[PDB]
Amino acid sequence: HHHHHMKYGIVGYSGRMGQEIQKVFSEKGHELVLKVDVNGVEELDSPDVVIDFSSPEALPKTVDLCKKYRAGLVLGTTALKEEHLQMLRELSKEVPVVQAYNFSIGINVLKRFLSELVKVLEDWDVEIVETHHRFKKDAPSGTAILLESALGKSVPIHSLRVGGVPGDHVVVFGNIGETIEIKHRAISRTVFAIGALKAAEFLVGKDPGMYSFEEVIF
Amino acid sequence: MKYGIVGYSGRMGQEIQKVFSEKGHELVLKVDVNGVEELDSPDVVIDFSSPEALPKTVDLCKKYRAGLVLGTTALKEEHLQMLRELSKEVPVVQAYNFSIGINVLKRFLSELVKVLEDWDVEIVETHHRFKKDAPSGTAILLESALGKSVPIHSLRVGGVPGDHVVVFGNIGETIEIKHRAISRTVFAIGALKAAEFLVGKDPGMYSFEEVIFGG
Amino acid sequence: HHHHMKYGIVGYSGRMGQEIQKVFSEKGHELVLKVDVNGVEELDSPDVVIDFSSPEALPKTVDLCKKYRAGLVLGTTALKEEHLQMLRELSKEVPVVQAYNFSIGINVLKRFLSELVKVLEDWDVEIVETHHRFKKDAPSGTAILLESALGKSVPIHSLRVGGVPGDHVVVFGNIGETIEIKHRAISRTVFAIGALKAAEFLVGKDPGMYSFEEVIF
Amino acid sequence: HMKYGIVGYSGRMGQEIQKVFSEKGHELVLKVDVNGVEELDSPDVVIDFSSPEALPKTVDLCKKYRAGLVLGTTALKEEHLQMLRELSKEVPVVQAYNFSIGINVLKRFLSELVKVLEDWDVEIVETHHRFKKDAPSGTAILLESALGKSVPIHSLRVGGVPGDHVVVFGNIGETIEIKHRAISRTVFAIGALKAAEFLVGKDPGMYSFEEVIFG
Ligand SMILES: NC(=O)c1ccc[n+]([C@@H]2O[C@H](COP(=O)([O-])OP(=O)(O)OC[C@H]3O[C@@H](n4cnc5c(N)ncnc54)[C@H](O)[C@@H]3O)[C@@H](O)[C@H]2O)c1
Ligand SMILES: NC(=O)c1ccc[n+]([C@@H]2O[C@H](COP(=O)([O-])OP(=O)(O)OC[C@H]3O[C@@H](n4cnc5c(N)ncnc54)[C@H](O)[C@@H]3O)[C@@H](O)[C@H]2O)c1
Ligand SMILES: NC(=O)c1ccc[n+]([C@@H]2O[C@H](COP(=O)([O-])OP(=O)(O)OC[C@H]3O[C@@H](n4cnc5c(N)ncnc54)[C@H](O)[C@@H]3O)[C@@H](O)[C@H]2O)c1
Ligand SMILES: NC(=O)c1ccc[n+]([C@@H]2O[C@H](COP(=O)([O-])OP(=O)(O)OC[C@H]3O[C@@H](n4cnc5c(N)ncnc54)[C@H](O)[C@@H]3O)[C@@H](O)[C@H]2O)c1
Numbered sequence: 001h002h003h004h005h006m007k008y009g010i011v012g013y014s015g016r017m018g019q020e021i022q023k024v025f026s027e028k029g030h031e032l033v034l035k036v037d038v039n040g041v042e043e044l045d046s047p048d049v050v051i052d053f054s055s056p057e058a059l060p061k062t063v064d065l066c067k068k069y070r071a072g073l074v075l076g077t078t079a080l081k082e083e084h085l086q087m088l089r090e091l092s093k094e095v096p097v098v099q100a101y102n103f104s105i106g107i108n109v110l111k112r113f114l115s116e117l118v119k120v121l122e123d124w125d126v127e128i129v130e131t132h133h134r135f136k137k138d139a140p141s142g143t144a145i146l147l148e149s150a151l152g153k154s155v156p157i158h159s160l161r162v163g164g165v166p167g168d169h170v171v172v173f174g175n176i177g178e179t180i181e182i183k184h185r186a187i188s189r190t191v192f193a194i195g196a197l198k199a200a201e202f203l204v205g206k207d208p209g210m211y212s213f214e215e216v217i218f
Numbered sequence: 219m220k221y222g223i224v225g226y227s228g229r230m231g232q233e234i235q236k237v238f239s240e241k242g243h244e245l246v247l248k249v250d251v252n253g254v255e256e257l258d259s260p261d262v263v264i265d266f267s268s269p270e271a272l273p274k275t276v277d278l279c280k281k282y283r284a285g286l287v288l289g290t291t292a293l294k295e296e297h298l299q300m301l302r303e304l305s306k307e308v309p310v311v312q313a314y315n316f317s318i319g320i321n322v323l324k325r326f327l328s329e330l331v332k333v334l335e336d337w338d339v340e341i342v343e344t345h346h347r348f349k350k351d352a353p354s355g356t357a358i359l360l361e362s363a364l365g366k367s368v369p370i371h372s373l374r375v376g377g378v379p380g381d382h383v384v385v386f387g388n389i390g391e392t393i394e395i396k397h398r399a400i401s402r403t404v405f406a407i408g409a410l411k412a413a414e415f416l417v418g419k420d421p422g423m424y425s426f427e428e429v430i431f432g433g
Numbered sequence: 434h435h436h437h438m439k440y441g442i443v444g445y446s447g448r449m450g451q452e453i454q455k456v457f458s459e460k461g462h463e464l465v466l467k468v469d470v471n472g473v474e475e476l477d478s479p480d481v482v483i484d485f486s487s488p489e490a491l492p493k494t495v496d497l498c499k500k501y502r503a504g505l506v507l508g509t510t511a512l513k514e515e516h517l518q519m520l521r522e523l524s525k526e527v528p529v530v531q532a533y534n535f536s537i538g539i540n541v542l543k544r545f546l547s548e549l550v551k552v553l554e555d556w557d558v559e560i561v562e563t564h565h566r567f568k569k570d571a572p573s574g575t576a577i578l579l580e581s582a583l584g585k586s587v588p589i590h591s592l593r594v595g596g597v598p599g600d601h602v603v604v605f606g607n608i609g610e611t612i613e614i615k616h617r618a619i620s621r622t623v624f625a626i627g628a629l630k631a632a633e634f635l636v637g638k639d640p641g642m643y644s645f646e647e648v649i650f
Numbered sequence: 651h652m653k654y655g656i657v658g659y660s661g662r663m664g665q666e667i668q669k670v671f672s673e674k675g676h677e678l679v680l681k682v683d684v685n686g687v688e689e690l691d692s693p694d695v696v697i698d699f700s701s702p703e704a705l706p707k708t709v710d711l712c713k714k715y716r717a718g719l720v721l722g723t724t725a726l727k728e729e730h731l732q733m734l735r736e737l738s739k740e741v742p743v744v745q746a747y748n749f750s751i752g753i754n755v756l757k758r759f760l761s762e763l764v765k766v767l768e769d770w771d772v773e774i775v776e777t778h779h780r781f782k783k784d785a786p787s788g789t790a791i792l793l794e795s796a797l798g799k800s801v802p803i804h805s806l807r808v809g810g811v812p813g814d815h816v817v818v819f820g821n822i823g824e825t826i827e828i829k830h831r832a833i834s835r836t837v838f839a840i841g842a843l844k845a846a847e848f849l850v851g852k853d854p855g856m857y858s859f860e861e862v863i864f865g
Contacts, residue, residue: 106391109333113326120322120430125566125594134557134606158590162557163606164833174566174595176237177404178319181396187810188834191390338780338808347771347820371804375771376820377619387780387809400596401620538824541766545759552755552865609837610752615827623823 002028003204009034009047009071011062012054017076020193021051028197034069036061047071049200053192059084063091072096072203074196076103078142089210096206100213101142103195106184107169108214111150114171114182118151121180124173126151131160131168143169166191219417222247222260222284224275225267230289233406234264241410247282249274260284262413266405272297276304285416287409288312302423309419313426316408319397320356320382322430324363327384327395331364334393337386339364344373344381356382435636441466441479441503443494444486448621449508453483456625457632466501468493479503481632485624487569491516495523504635506628507531510574521642528638532645533574535627538616539601540646543582546603546614550583553612556605558583563592563600575601654846655680655693655717657708658700663722666839667697674843680715682707693717695846699838705730709737718849720842721745724788735856742852746859747788749841752830753815754860757796760817760828764797767826770819772797777806777814789815812837 012018013035033045053076139159167186225231227250246258266289343357352372380399444450445467465477485508571591599618658664660683679691699722776790785805813832
């Protein structure tokens, strides 16, 4: 289940997520050998795995680095487009890849449940309310989009950008007599960095291809 | 559909008329403590009255081969027996709670707790200031769905019809599942869904869960 | 307190209109005027008119109030500058109470939020409001009212779900903490009761615009 | 720039305090926890988030070094308050059961709001991480005191929740909830730093954290 002294890279090493990843990975004795952010690339040694929480525009560099080092990829960057998914599919023919818009247990558990619930609550009104810290660049959140896809239809998404909220999502179902709310809260960013570590450890030694974070966890 | 109401004059009965008429259904049979009024043949009968009314209800359903949605509480063994005999001839849905949401959630929570078995779980329930019993029966039903004893916290404030919250937590995350009863209309809506389900069905007893889930 | 008022309802057939009839009749007041999208029914002269309908109805409301010199309790939301002007003109002749929210809690909170925003001036603030699926206006009047108590425009998020009578949440956030101030109308009856208080207040008053805060505080 | 001590240096709050204080360039010269005392130099101020049983040592150290005290430990008893008063004749002290801006702003607002909503029912729901030893929380007690009367407190002990408090007011027709959430424990350490900087150079006595914030 675990790997000893992995060498790893981070794309987005300087950002919020990047620094959480360094803290979590270093505590488990893993070694940072590759740093990429908007200001450059720093290659110190060959990574076994690369972790990317940055921006979609960075993904070409990320993929090239993974190909260069035959390093697996844990990708958390949100707001990916079709072009980005194609690049990942190409990469996955060479290395193991885990791409997820949310590295928590609870969102991935709920996303499955919501796919079943929506079928029984098909005639109820449904909206999503998501809340994140003030400087989050993307709205709606990737996670809101992920939950909307689990619902199997387009729903109103409301995005709050407030304080230092790590990430809350609420799915609201309503009928004339009652309401149901399904709420998830990430207590800190560390929970995503721990998910990323689980995914990294899963990937090491795997054959090439795309793996779901659900497979990582279930 | 053509439908009847036993208890048409009561709180629930007036709520049923509103909800059914809004969907374009036709009231053709009215029963209360003061009498029976047969206007046309009902496809389904809806009963929220009193256990003493059930004999007449059963008789009417047999007469018109009409299905029955039964919400009357405090039924005795004798009432259950009448109901079983009726269900040999017509389709029947009996439930002591037609909140659709609570029923849906109770199943959902039985599955969710297995996945989140190492998460801490508590219940917070809120009712109006006069509610005599704590914890509420719904909180006890939800605890039973969770398959284990959990802390239940009971707030008694103002005129709240009924809220229930199941809180799951681990070190890095929290999940809350909440249900809010806006009002008595929630049960009339449940009864509408059961009525529409029952139309055209083969005789027998159907659980409200299978109304909501297609078994 | 005024015994056996004669009153009219604009919007008598709507959700609020029916709640008004129930609340007013229970206090022994008499409905003498009914106005809806389908017509006008004048049975007797009203002392007061209660309007929870649509801004398009306001011209007829005003005309009726002028005709019978009847005061006006107005709850209709999404009023425009033209509607406010017709109201001002009306209030030269009769007493008027216009409010986007007739509950105790919201009116208590609005004062509390004016003070709280001053102390939490550097915190981010947004509003989340929730109403039933058929509500025609977004954002709600009450959200606008709350913004105005905060002394600034803020993001308002409007959910239109099921049968929710009316929820409003003001969210304040800092880097290390959040505060939410939430109000829930358990039923629509709370607004009809507010309207009744406002109607009783208005009877015998001199012409002008009166705030519902004045009605209650 | 300050020399400071921490009672509870090894705990959750203790490690947060070290991070926040060292980032502002303050120097840790005294470490106390359940396994011992480590005196490196004389502190100007001591910060104590530990256990009520540690308070005697905390007091003795502050007297020894004539150091101010910032005390966050909860579940203090009359005896602990007495020792603290005695200490405060010699040094400046800030004791608080919550070091967040939001709670100390709300407590004042709840004192006024409860007067206006005197006939509304009121309860408190508080939620903290699974390991919290004391229930109800000191903050819940503080809020109850701002409300000027005894109120039902419901305590959830779930996962890793830093600290949530909800004051629920209810009437027949409406409800009001006033909720505070501590996003991380850092917020309390930052409060403790504000308190420690306030205390420097102050006359002896007890100062409220509200005075530290000025309102
Ligand atoms: N999947 C998950 O569980 C999850 C969780 C949290 C955040 N995220 C996502 O992670 C991403 C980063 O979030 P954050 O809060 O750390 O943002 P951030 O702004 O703090 O960090 C961005 C990092 O990316 C770098 N960067 C930005 N654009 C770049 C470019 N075009 N080329 C190279 N480097 C670039 C920055 O220099 C910085 O190091 C976002 O897309 C966010 O939504 C995903
Ligand atoms: N299952 C649910 O979802 C649900 C929810 C709420 C209430 N209930 C139940 O519904 C029933 C009705 O509740 P309610 O609040 O409408 O009460 P109610 O007192 O307002 O109405 C009672 C109705 O029953 C009629 N009735 C009583 N005895 C009768 C008799 N023997 N013969 C014919 N009619 C008779 C009355 O005439 C009246 O119309 C109760 O048993 C209650 O427990 C069920
Ligand atoms: N101020 C408050 O405390 C408060 C509280 C609740 C609702 N409201 C407001 O009350 C108003 C109506 O709410 P509702 O839920 O009752 O609406 P509704 O749709 O249920 O009823 C609308 C009523 O207005 C009538 N109407 C519509 N257009 C008309 C016209 N051109 N001329 C005459 N009558 C017309 C309809 O026939 C109906 O009787 C809205 O503006 C709503 O936002 C205010
Ligand atoms: N006032 C506030 O703003 C606030 C905020 C958070 C926590 N707290 C309180 O702070 C205290 C500590 O919380 P925590 O979560 O960091 O607890 P913790 O369990 O992580 O740490 C307790 C610390 O105190 C030490 N300790 C215990 N008994 C001792 C003794 N007899 N002598 C010397 N040291 C002893 C431990 O070694 C440890 O260093 C609690 O009382 C908690 O309620 C207060």
